[PDB]
Amino acid sequence: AEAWYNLGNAYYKQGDYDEAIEYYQKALELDPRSAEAWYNLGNAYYKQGDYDEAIEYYQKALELDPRSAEAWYNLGNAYYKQGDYDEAIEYYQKALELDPRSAEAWYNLGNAYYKQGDYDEAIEYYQKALELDPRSAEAWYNLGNAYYKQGDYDEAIEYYQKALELDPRSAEAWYNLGNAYYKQGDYDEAIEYYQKALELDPRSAEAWYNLGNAYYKQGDYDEAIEYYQKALELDPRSAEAWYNLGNAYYKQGDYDEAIEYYQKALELDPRS
Ligand SMILES: [Cu+2]
Ligand SMILES: [Cu+2]
Incomplete structure (x- = not known):
């Protein structure tokens, strides 16, 4: 036995x-x-x-x-x-x-x-x-995620910072700190934290996407456009990227380009 x-x-x-x-x-x-x-x-x-x-x-x-x-x-x-x-x-x-x-x-x-x-x-x-x-590290990280999910962006940030103090090479902690700042309306910080995330993993489509959204929100449509393109060259199947690119062109007054990017988005989701 x-x-x-x-x-x-x-x-x-x-x-x-x-x-x-x-x-x-x-x-x-x-x-x-x-x-x-x-x-x-x-x-x-x-x-x-x-x-x-x-x-x-x-x-x-x-x-x-x-x-x-x-x-x-x-x-x-x-x-x-x-x-x-x-x-x-x-x-x-x-x-x-x-x-x-x-x-x-x-x-x-x-x-x-x-x-x-x-x-x-x-x-x-x-x-x-x-x-x-x-x-x-992971338990401060998940404590941050819990505060984030109930809308305590201030507590979330405190706990994500603790997590980074123990593992600074964690792209996701950086990214989620970006999102917390994003949700507070602090797009300058969001951008610093997303760029750090991208240094550590430059093939994350969603982080280029959210970096685009942070610039979009400050009113820098040119910079938004460069990062939405970066996202599309990693995931050309994402209707939300095409859409947001449409919007960036719309906000600049480029209605031809808006039309094109909105038609693409709609080939990938005709019910939206
Ligand atoms: Cu059995
Ligand atoms: Cu209890």
Whole structure:
């Protein structure tokens, strides 16, 4: 049993999930009262993207040991990846009852609430996560996103700044700080933060798009036009870019070009 099991673990650790499953089953054929085998079968299925099966195997493991914090956590994670945020929350709580010192369960409970649109629950659980790990870039980042989503652009900015203080090479943190400034009506800052994002990933269409929109909003239609073109040469299928380019030409008084760019947008969305 033990040797079929460590053979399974060997295949698992080198990423061969199908072989790992073969040997974990052999282990269970000899010792089916073993919660670790059931659990690791779960993990194997989880890693293949088979979340229905991971759940079956994790629940089995939990019958044979309902005191494993890690198995409740992984069951929550399986539900979360299926899109069942309610069951996720139930199992994450269960994990937290057995180990409330775990930043990762708090964080993931935050995320489950975020995905339901319960932004202030998200915030409470992310704040808890951060009591227990003040050096988690991603958790300041997601705390920022929660404040952003409920319209607290000031708190969002405070938290995105914390995230950048821990990982300055993160294009998305820069980009989202841009968006926060954008939404406050501060287009000068939006532009500085979007340009930084673009230095770090120059093939993001949406960032060229939003950079175009920031210039558009200041009234610099020439500069807006250069950045909408940059966006279109990465995604020529986006009707919103064609449209916004139409508008920039319209605002300049170039009604010929507006006509052309609006006709393109409408070939790509005739119902809009
Ligand atoms: Cu099954
Ligand atoms: Cu609460």
